[PDB]
Symmetry: C4
Subunit: 262 residues, 4 copies
């Protein structure tokens, strides 16, 4: 099951735009980007391979002329993140939470960043789906950008799904920047998350599967082709920019519709 499968976008028959005028650019964490998707790193042979495709493809890469941001677990003290930032000069700091993966100081550390840190920073949930309450909390600390990342061992089906968390977070989007990740397989999933209102979409699982299957050159090729697919899809939806996608009509089916129809 992938929640994006429960979403249908309304096709538009009479196109207004040439394929080449389609604008793929977006903005978050105080930065303009050429492309609305990016790469989150994973052994270390993998991450080198990924930094390679990001650089050639001109994509942000979240851990030379490579658009760079750094990640740190919120379990670490604030000084550790401040130092990561000083040493690396990333576009921004991303701090992640994995409650259930873990299952205290976390909110202390979070507090410390929101107030002290001068560079833009992002709070990232790690796959369990970030609930509205937590989104509101972050907003109240003055967090400007969150990665909403959604989906004994009777508990491992825990958490909300990506699409579902994106839908719930919709009322808050005029107050915070939303980033989606988790369960994104291809450019249609990407377009879906954007339609739902994410500023951009982080890729993880898919990228690793690609490098495990394809050489870096092949992946670079695949990823650049994905750029085309994005334009193609948006042409078909009659949208000339990334922002216009937020006006695309869509339909919910199955569990996703159920979840929104209580």
């Amino acid at each position: 099951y992938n929640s994006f499968d429960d979403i249908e976008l309304i096709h538009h028959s009479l196109p207004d735009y040439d394929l080449a005028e389609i604008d793929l650019s977006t903005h978050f964490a105080g930065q303009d980007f050429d492309f609305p998707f990016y790469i989150n790193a994973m052994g270390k042979e993998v991450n080198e391979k990924l930094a390679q495709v990001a650089d050639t493809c001109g994509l942000l890469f979240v851990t030379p002329h490579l658009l760079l941001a750094t990640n740190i677990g919120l379990d670490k003290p604030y000084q550790a993140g401040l130092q990561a930032v000083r040493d690396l000069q990333p576009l921004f700091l991303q701090v992640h939470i994995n409650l259930m993966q873990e299952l205290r100081s976390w909110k202390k550390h979070l507090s410390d960043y929101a107030k002290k840190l001068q560079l833009p920073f992002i709070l990232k949930e790690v796959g369990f789906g970030m609930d509205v309450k937590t989104i509101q909390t972050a907003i109240d600390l003055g967090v400007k950008t969150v990665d909403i990342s959604g989906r004994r061992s009777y508990l491992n089906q825990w958490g909300q799904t990506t699409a579902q968390v994106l839908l719930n977070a919709q009322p808050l989007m005029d107050k915070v920047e939303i980033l989606a990740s988790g369960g994104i397989r291809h450019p249609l999933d990407i377009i879906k998350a954007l339609v739902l209102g994410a500023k951009a979409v982080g890729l993880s699982r898919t990228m690793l599967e690609l490098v495990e299957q394809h050489s870096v050159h092949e992946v670079i090729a695949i990823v650049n082709g994905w750029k085309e697919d994005l334009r193609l899809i948006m042409c078909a939806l009659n949208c000339q920019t990334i922002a216009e996608l937020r006006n695309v009509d869509y339909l919910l089916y199955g569990r996703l519709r159920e979840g929104q129809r209580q």
Copy 2:
């Protein structure tokens, strides 16, 4: 999956009409037709066969008695379509939009700014009636509305009957349902995923003036002799009055007051 399978017609137990008084005629593209369904590089053989059944069975087809219409892509200039009309003197012109088909085609159209221009020229300059036809993905309401605004009188809403995109578009029933608010502003024609006369009746109930068949017709000629296909087809005209008798409807138009129920995905998509 076919979306018509998610529609249930309410049958009527005590009939008022005999099987032989049921009226099958309809009207669109400025023409009267006796029947509410019609037919849409070797290839050229299959089309000889289809034209044959059409002429014989009295169906529109898209032989001086053959009721013919001709098709052209909207990517062509208005002038090309006009040549077509002048050349073949068809009942009407059918202009197709196949955006997604083009986009997925390696050698396909890549620029579309002109499509709207071409469409405008037809609505305002073409004498003969024309139909704007979608090719397979389901014509959305916004497109329909624009057409209406440009002065288009008839549309074929043709819905769904890398590989991650192969389920793009809306289903036929679904597009007919969405289009219902505009059915008094433009003529709706149905096509895509029409298997049999029950699908035909369903499309008409939802409010289409008529229903085009394609795939089903290949399938038939692809496993029967013209003579035998003409048989099934004429017999479909008898399935139509039969179905209609049991729905207690005496004319095509009356089918729009047949009560029905929606189930599953089709109902889901209609109740957001």
Copy 3:
């Protein structure tokens, strides 16, 4: 195989008010009191089956059509034929059947239907005995039921569903029962089609049918068991009816109308358009 009764759940009642033996199974329709709320509808041989069916009805104390006896006639027959049936047999009532789709899907099936309404009008106008208008297999719609009401018909059997592409034409028994509820004060409703067991029977009764007729189920029974065993199974069904009714806390057939139920799936979908 889909059966719409399976889309209905009855709300159990934990704390019983009644003893099992006081549960009353008696009902009333077409001007007759009957001991039980289910009856049998008959099938060239053929005759052999109907012999067996009549023997279980007689022994089990059940109404049998066509001993508690009623007669059936196709509505394509002229009224006088129905009249002579009543005169000759002295049945409890006359059941007149319509089978439109069945006639349509049949080569020889009489394709002229103009006379059915005429004949129905004739029976309403001339026939003293109560008579039932009975759909055959496809579900009687609210429009037909209302027309019956207008003609003076007091009882209908709404008999729902329980080339090939028309093989699933028509409404399911449960669905037709639900559609008919708003008319249940103006006409008596009988259910048939797709009744497999006493729980199906209870469900139909809850939905508001006065009684339910069995057809295919009876045929299946005599095909698998001796007549003795069928009699045993059927009398056992009586106890099942009381048992279920006890569990629901309903002491009479009429009280089943007050039983809470939930709808699921297609059946629920059918009521949430």
Copy 4:
């Protein structure tokens, strides 16, 4: 199919509590308990009593053993007053197994007494008592009668010839149905509880406590007593863990947790 699987709890990414702050205590039938789940019960009862005593759990049929005793409502008030006298339990549980008895060829056939018997307890018994359904789900009407009869605690025990063996309502469905009565009576949940997440779900739906039976029988059937004790004790940490992820400090606060309903359960709620 288990009805709890149609319920999704809305979790909380950044908590407010540690696992040590989580209060697991509850109260019903006049008694404080340190834990919100308990055991419903011969050689197997032998073992189950040893797990309960050692784990500090209520045990409904060892001076430290928190004991309660069960009796069928088909018994006259005399037999139940005896039970209390003989065993000095924390409370008496009176069960109603209507459908079970109807499907028993030797089972009860008269029932008019049951409501009489219930009212006697309601009038003659000093010791608190619980009215317990056995497996088929206690319906709103029956609960309302208990209320009017003065009964203060019920176990709503839900689902979780053969055409009848899906009779009754599921545990979660009966919980949902009973909600409007949760300020008028104590609701105990049982029937198809597999693990601590089912426990939490029942508590969130508003039960004061969750009773286990089948699972317990399986555990002492697929394990040794000591293991079972380790198993149940581990369940206690799971409860705090879930409650932390849900950001709840007490059992009570569970009723403010947000949830979504799917499938059959949602369908039953939208008629």
